[PDB]
């Protein structure tokens, strides 16, 4: 298999340098050229540069001055140095993999959502939702966190039916999203369904075991 | 009175002008002496393994070869490496004599007329001496010590009959390979020091090739070192540079294989990209026949891939009439200026003529990933810059000339001699900081001394 | 620099309708020495990294379903799905497989037509943990409706409150091709306990009358 | 002096030291040696129609006119001043610069056999030959011409030695590069070696009767030199590559090193004294013709200073084509005079009567030579044209300040 693990999203103050990593496995790093691709959300893709086994870069002219691609041959990972981050650098930074001088990025990375701002990291405040008073819905309201990516699943891969995780909206410089799951009413009294959150900018993993209303 | 000063000032002023002229030629740098160029250094070689298939259908005699030489000297080759024509019945030791020619090929008086007609065109015939050229094991598996003396006794006979060198192949199949090449290089040079001995090997790794060249430093060693270069020429910059430092920049042959063509190893998109490289590297390129028109062992049914049939015109292959097109022939490519036969006649023109490509120096510098580039220079003649793009994309070559000496450094513009792909204008000056090559394009740029 | 222009900005089809999307390059993307066209086609499912489908303008990559056929040369190209499935909802891009600066495409979003379906309105009171910290917010979910244009209006026991409400549609499902909509109201501790009944109203094309779910604070 | 010994007086003048510089320049603009050989044989019989009609002209202007320029030009064109001025500033000293410069390249070519010679070191040694030979004329006119006749033997045996090796060793039409801008610019370089036929009346007319001798003594002396100029090209085309002699400053030294090791010692001292005396003899004729208040001595210092001004050039073949544009200009204005004297004056012409066939072949031919190179590259013709009109300031200085 070909796996390209990636660091996950990071928050930085403006005009600070950023080094993003693209740690790989499953193939020799010296025999294929690893490229970097920028994408802002809701827009088009943009290409940044390349690398090799001789650390030879082929950068693009729109983004040549503030990018410095490097490769660590020992741990099999490549680096990308940001410089003088302006507010129009909040984007995803994919790290793909192309054959030896063919420019056909087959196996892509997982994505790192770089978000640049002057604000402070805030841990989320998660509250459950109970219906009270033929199937019924359970909700998980996650409120008050500044760095945008949060992955919410139900009982870590147990519940895959009706799992609607809504996109995050911005108000008061914090993000609030809510999730929903649809299950019959025979299971949830006879079990317990627990919302779990993951905040990869802070690793604040909080669970809330849902109690039923009376 | 008036006669005193004005002639004395000329008596001062003439020595006032001689004092400049006597030191300026001392401050100016002088040439270093040219190396003694032997006859094979002055160009390429050209191998003919099968006379039966070079012209075709029973007319493969040595007597019919004389009409081909005016074509074969338009390519401007400097040698000719005729296949094993001695009498040999396969896998039989006692019934093989290297003195007498097989009567299917001709006779002894036909061969001596061939050497005379080749001297008028400055073409040197190098006789092959692989003793068993019909068995799968080339060097007579048992009783190896008399076949050493069968070649040693036959190294005197063809040398007193006027051949100009020798060639043995498959030296990985006999024992004591490094010592038998020492006795024969002595005999071939002790007769005259303008004779040759090209050995051939199939081993691709470097550590077996240096062990043959550590005893004898005066033979060419053709091998399949450059053969397994990669899918798209991946390790070509790595294999060329590491081999020239392994020998300390000596003289060495540059060929893809010991017997096979170019297209047994490369895609058809990489043929014009390797003929540019094989001429401009510091050595004698050793082509096989058909490598100037792009002959293919495949794409024609019923062909032995060891010895394909040459395609002179559309009547060259009468067995399958609809196979041979009008752009695959020698006649069809001679007038087409964008063909492959014109590239072989433009590059072998520059290899025989200019003095940087003849015996200049080699300094390859860093560039972008996926492309290869190097410089060629003698003392004060024209300088040459080759740029080869091995990738399947349009990379912009970023040439980083930070380790070149001050005598051979890059200019800001250099005019294009020829490119392997049509689409650029030739002779016009070309900037170097914005080069922007095409997919699989190679360039040949020249620039003067200007130092 | 080659400029890539993807023609349809957004299309909507039903299942099995043989959709095509066009493309156009500024410079010619056909190298006239090998006569092979150089263009690529990527597929970006929502919330995921992109995935290669077609390179050299007609060669499907390893592991791609055979619905994706791409053809053309010169400066016109076309990706064709023979018959779309329920999971082929994604965004399709265009690269330039032979260039120094590889300029990507604009993008084209593929929607899916389905028959109309009514929502499933559910309303939640604030939880006991949120009541401890001093904040109050009520949530009105709307599940599994197709046409993706619902105007939710909030009413507090007969008073239509329409100031400071949040809405966030989710992207279209890959299983049943439906949408979802959440609606949360931002109030205080004092503003929530000053009233008893809260009304969430859902306007749709399936029904003329809105669907109403509600609750009372006092029980 | 008879017909036989009188012909040997002619070949002593026309075989100059220009032969050692031009075959590089005739091959550079004609490509292949087979076309380069026919350019050599063309300009030889091109000279024989022009040098014979001058022999019909020069015998009349010496008896009835009595001078080189003036008394002929008071028939032809009374502004003769610019004609003597173009003759004395760009015709005489530039000819004295080239023959001085070939001495400089051949003297240093053993030191730099494969390198090009440092061109700013060839400017110094060329002017070191002229300042030695300017002062030797002004100090003693007797001692100047005495070793000059000894140096006249040096240009012959060094030329015969090259042809001596041209027979010991023993495509051609492939690289033609035919162009009307190239076939007239390679014809200028071959005509530079045929020097002194326009001064041929002062050498041979005094000895014997010019009735039928002087056409017959020139119709056989020009084919006997054109053979020697061709036979020194085949000694180059067989002993060297066409690519080796295209990149060469001294082609004879590259020839001499190929054959014997101490023949490299003997060539640049033999051809070195060839152009050493050829610039010595060129200072003699340019000294007297301005005279024929002022002694002959300041005529020697004026052609000395104005030949050092040509060290600001860049190559020999630039100033050769600068020379041949104006050397062939002034000969066309001379031969237009004699055809104008075919209806004007009786002249008492009994040296030679024939003026029908030969001059009309020539005047249309040198007009073709002057037409192509003016349209080709006038950056050397225009700087020569911006100074021929500059004599008219000096002409206004002569009209009124002496009146
Ligand atoms: C290069 O030549 C060597 C000669 O030894 C080949 O090695 C032999 O290969 C045959 C069949 O491939 C085996 O039966 C022998 O045992 C091998 N001998 C040794 C000593 O290894 C080798 O295969 C050749 N390589 C190529 C690519 O043809
Ligand atoms: C007008 C007369 C006096 C000119 C005389 C020129 C003399 C001084 C020149 C012309 C030819 C020259 C020689 C040409 C070649 C060589 C061989 C070289 O390895 C050492 C210098 C040496 C030996 C030169 C010495 C100087 C030399 C003899
Ligand atoms: C103003 C008039 C009277 C001056 C007369 C003498 C002139 C023509 C001569 C005398 C010395 C000569 C110089 C001697 C040496 C050199 C060095 C060479 O690399 C270029 C030419 C150059 C620079 C010459 C130019 C012409 C020169 C200046
Ligand atoms: C007629 C006159 C003006 C000619 C003058 C020529 C002079 C400048 C030339 C001719 C011979 C030359 C010498 C020939 C050989 C050598 C030996 C070499 O290792 C250093 C330079 C040196 C010493 C040369 C210096 C310059 C030189 C003296
Ligand atoms: C290059 C620059 C400096 C000009 C050089 C001019 C030289 C060559 C000229 C100018 C003046 C000349 C001198 C003028 C007068 C005489 C007196 C005569 O009884 C012998 C010659 C002699 C001694 C001349 C020698 C040459 C001379 C020195
Ligand atoms: C009449 C007086 C003032 C000057 C006499 C010497 C004249 C005729 C000489 C001396 C310097 C010479 C110039 C020197 C260099 C060049 C550059 C070359 O690319 C074309 C010819 C040209 C332009 C020459 C033309 C002739 C020239 C001007
Ligand atoms: C050949 O070998 C002999 C003895 O083995 C030796 O004396 C001779 O020098 C050799 N010839 C060469 C090295 O040219
Ligand atoms: C060439 O030789 C050494 C030995 O392998 C190699 O490591 C190095 O790259 C080169 N050294 C020099 C001085 O060129
Ligand atoms: C020669 O021409 C044919 C057309 O008949 C073409 O198919 C073929 O590709 C050409 N050969 C090469 C090497 O391009």
Summarize the entry for a quick read.
Chain B is an alpha/beta fold and about 450 residues long. In chain B, about 25% of the residues lie in helices and about 15% in strands. Chain C is elongated and about 80 Å long.
Notes on the protein architecture:
The complex is a heterotetramer of chains A (214), B (451), C (219) and D (403). Chain A is mostly beta strands and 214 residues long. Chain A has two domains: 118 residues, no CATH class; 94 residues, Immunoglobulins (Immunoglobulin-like, Sandwich), CATH 2.60.40. Chain A is built from no helices and 18 strands. By secondary structure, chain B is an alpha/beta fold. Helices cover 27% and strands 14% of the residues of chain B. In chain B, a hairpin with a 6-residue loop joins β11 and β12. The longest helix of chain B is centred in the N-terminal third of the chain and has 26 residues. Chain C has two domains: 114 residues, Immunoglobulin-like, CATH 2.60.40; 99 residues, Immunoglobulins (Immunoglobulin-like, Sandwich), CATH 2.60.40.10. Chain D starts with a helix and ends with a helix. Chain D is globular. Chain D has 403 residues and is mainly alpha-helical. Helices cover 67% and strands 0% of the residues of chain D. The longest helix of chain D is centred in the first third of the chain and has 33 residues. Chains A and C meet through β11, β12, β14 and β16 of A and β7, α1, β14, β17 and β18 of C. The structure holds a molecule of 2 linked components (NAG-NAG), cholesterol (5 copies) and 2-acetamido-2-deoxy-beta-D-glucopyranose (NAG) (3 copies). The site of one 2-acetamido-2-deoxy-beta-D-glucopyranose has 3 residues of chain B, from α6. The PDB classes it as membrane protein/immune system. Keywords: Complex, MEMBRANE PROTEIN-IMMUNE SYSTEM complex. It forms a tetrameric assembly. The entry is titled "LAT1-CD98hc complex bound to MEM-108 Fab".
């Amino acid at each position: 298999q070909v796996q390209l693990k990636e660091s996950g999203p990071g928050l930085v103050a403006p005009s600070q340098s950023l080094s993003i990593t693209c740690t790989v496995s499953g193939f020799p790093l010296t025999x294929x050229x690893x490229x970097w691709v920028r994408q802002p959300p809701g827009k088009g893709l943009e290409w940044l540069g390349x690398x090799x086994x001789x650390x030879x870069x082929x950068x693009x002219x729109x983004x040549x001055x503030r990018l410095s691609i490097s490769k660590d041959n020992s741990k099999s990972q490549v680096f990308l140095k940001m410089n003088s981050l302006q507010t129009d650098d909040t984007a995803r930074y994919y790290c793909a993999r192309x054959x030896x001088x063919x420019x056909x990025x087959x196996x892509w990375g997982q994505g790192t959502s770089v978000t640049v701002s002057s604000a402070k990291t805030t841990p989320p405040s998660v509250y459950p939702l109970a219906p009270g008073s033929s199937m019924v819905t359970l909700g998980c309201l996650v409120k008050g966190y500044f760095p945008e990516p949060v992955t919410v699943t139900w009982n870590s891969g147990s519940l895959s039916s009706g799992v609607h995780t809504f996109p995050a909206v911005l108000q008061s410089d914090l993000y609030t999203l809510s999730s929903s799951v649809t299950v019959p009413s025979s299971t949830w009294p006879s079990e317990t369904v627990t919302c779990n959150v993951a905040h990869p900018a802070s690793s604040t993993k909080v669970d809330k075991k849902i109690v039923p209303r009376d | 009175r008036t006669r005193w000063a004005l002639l004395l000032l000329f008596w001062l002023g003439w020595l006032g002008m001689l004092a400049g002229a006597v030191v300026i030629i001392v401050r100016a740098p002088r040439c270093r002496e040219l190396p003694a160029q032997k006859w094979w250094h002055t160009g390429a070689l050209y191998r003919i393994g099968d006379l039966q298939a070079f012209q075709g259908h029973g007319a493969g005699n040595l007597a019919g070869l004389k009409g081909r030489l005016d074509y074969l000297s338009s390519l401007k080759v400097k040698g000719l490496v005729l296949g094993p024509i001695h009498k040999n019945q396969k896998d039989d030791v006692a019934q093989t004599d290297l003195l007498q020619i097989d009567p299917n090929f001709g006779s002894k008086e036909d061969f001596d007329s061939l050497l005379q007609s080749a001297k008028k065109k400055s073409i040197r015939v190098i006789l092959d001496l692989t003793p068993n050229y019909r068995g799968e094991n080339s060097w007579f598996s048992t009783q190896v010590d008399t076949v050493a003396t069968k070649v040693k006794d036959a190294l005197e006979f063809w040398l007193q009959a006027g051949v100009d060198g020798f060639q043995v192949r498959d030296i990985e199949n006999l024992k004591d390979a490094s010592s038998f090449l020492a006795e024969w290089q002595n005999i071939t040079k002790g007769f005259s020091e303008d004779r040759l001995l090209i050995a051939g090997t199939n081993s691709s790794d470097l550590q077996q090739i240096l062990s043959l060249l550590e005893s004898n430093k005066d033979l060419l060693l053709t091998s399949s070192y450059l053969s397994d270069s990669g899918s798209t020429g991946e390790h070509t910059k790595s294999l060329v540079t590491q081999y020239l430092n392994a020998t300390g920049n000596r003289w060495c042959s540059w060929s893809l294989s010991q017997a096979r063509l170019l297209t047994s190893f490369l895609p058809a998109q990489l043929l014009r990209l390797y003929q540019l490289m094989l001429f401009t590297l510091p050595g004698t390129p050793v082509f096989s026949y058909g490598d100037e028109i792009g002959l293919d062992a495949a794409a024609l049914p019923g062909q032995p891939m060891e010895a394909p049939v040459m395609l002179w015109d559309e009547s060259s292959f009468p067995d399958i009439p609809g196979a041979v097109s009008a752009n695959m022939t020698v006649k069809g490519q001679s007038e087409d200026p964008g063909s492959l036969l014109s590239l072989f006649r433009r590059l072998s023109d520059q290899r025989s003529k200019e003095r940087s490509l003849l015996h200049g120096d080699f300094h390859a510098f860093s560039a972008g990933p996926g492309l290869f580039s190097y410089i060629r220079h003698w003392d004060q003649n024209e300088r040459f810059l080759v740029v080869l793009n091995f990738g399947d994309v349009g990379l912009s070559a970023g040439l980083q000339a930070s380790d070149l000496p001050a005598s051979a450094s890059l200019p800001a513009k250099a005019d294009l001699l020829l490119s392997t792909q049509p689409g650029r204008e030739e002779g016009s000056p070309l900037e170097l900081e914005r080069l922007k090559l095409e997919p699989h394009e190679g360039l040949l740029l020249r620039f003067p001394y200007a130092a | 620099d080659i400029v890539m222009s993807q023609s349809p900005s957004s299309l909507v089809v039903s299942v099995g309708e043989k959709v095509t999307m066009s493309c156009x390059x500024x410079x010619x993307x056909x190298x006239x020495x090998x006569x092979x066209x150089x263009x690529x086609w990527y597929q970006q499912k929502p919330g995921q990294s992109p995935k290669l489908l077609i390179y050299x303008x007609x060669x499907x990559x390893x592991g791609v379903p055979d619905r994706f056929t791409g053809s053309g040369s010169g400066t016109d190209f076309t990706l064709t799905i023979s018959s779309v499935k329920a999971e082929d909802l994604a965004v399709y891009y265009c690269x330039x497989x032979x260039x120094x600066x590889x300029x990507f495409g604009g993008g084209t979003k593929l929607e899916i037509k389905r028959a109309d379906a009514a929502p499933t309105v559910s309303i939640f009171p604030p939880s006991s943990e949120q009541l401890t910290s001093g904040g109050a917010s009520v949530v009105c979910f709307l599940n599994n409706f197709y046409p993706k244009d619902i105007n939710v209006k909030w009413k507090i026991d007969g008073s239509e409150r329409q100031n400071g409400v949040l809405n966030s549609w989710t992207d279209q499902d890959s299983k049943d091709s439906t949408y979802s909509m959440s609606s949360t109201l931002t109030l205080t501790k004092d503003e929530y306990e000053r009233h008893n009944s809260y009304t969430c109203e859902a306007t749709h094309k399936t029904s003329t009358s809105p669907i109403v779910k509600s609750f009372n604070r006092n029980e | 002096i008879t017909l036989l010994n009188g012909v040997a007086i002619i070949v002593g003048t026309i075989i100059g030291s220009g032969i050692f510089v031009t075959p590089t320049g005739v091959l550079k603009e004609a490509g292949s040696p087979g076309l380069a050989l026919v350019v050599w044989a063309a300009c030889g019989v091109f000279s024989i129609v022009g040098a014979l009609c001058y022999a019909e002209l020069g015998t009349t202007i010496s008896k009835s006119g009595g001078d080189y320029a003036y008394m002929l030009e008071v028939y032809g064109s009374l502004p003769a001043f610019l004609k003597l001025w173009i003759e004395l500033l760009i015709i005489r000293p530039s000819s004295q610069y080239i023959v001085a410069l070939v001495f400089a390249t051949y003297l240093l070519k053993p030191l730099f056999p494969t390198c090009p010679v440092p061109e700013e070191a060839a400017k110094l040694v060329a002017c070191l030959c002229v300042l030695l030979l300017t002062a030797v004329n002004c100090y003693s006119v007797k001692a100047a011409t005495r070793v000059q006749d000894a140096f006249a033997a040096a240009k012959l045996l060094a030329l015969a030695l090259i042809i001596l090796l041209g027979f010991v060793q023993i495509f051609s039409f492939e690289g033609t590069k035919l162009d009307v801008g190239n076939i007239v610019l390679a014809l200028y370089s071959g005509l530079f070696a045929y020097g002194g036929w326009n001064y041929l009346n002062f050498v041979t007319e005094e000895m014997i009767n010019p009735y039928r001798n002087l056409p017959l003594a020139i119709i056989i002396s020009l084919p006997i030199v054109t053979l020697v100029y061709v036979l020194t090209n085949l000694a180059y085309f067989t002993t060297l590559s066409t690519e080796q002699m295209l990149s060469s400053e001294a082609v004879a030294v590259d020839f001499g090193n190929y054959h014997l090791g101490v023949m490299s010692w003997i060539i640049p001292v033999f051809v070195g004294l060839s152009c050493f005396g050829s610039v010595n003899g060129s200072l003699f004729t340019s000294s007297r013709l301005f005279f024929v208040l002022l002694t002959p001595v300041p005529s020697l210092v004026f052609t000395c200073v104005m030949t050092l001004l040509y060290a600001f050039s860049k190559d020999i073949f630039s100033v050769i084509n600068f020379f041949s544009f104006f050397n062939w200009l002034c000969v066309a204005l001379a031969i237009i005079g004699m055809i104008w004297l075919r209806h004007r004056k009786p002249e008492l012409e009994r040296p030679i009567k024939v003026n029908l066939a030969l001059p009309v072949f020539f005047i249309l031919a040198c007009l073709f030579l002057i037409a192509v190179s003016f349209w080709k590259t006038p950056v050397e013709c225009g700087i020569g044209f911006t100074i021929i009109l500059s004599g008219l300031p000096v002409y206004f200085f002569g009209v009124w300040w002496k009146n």
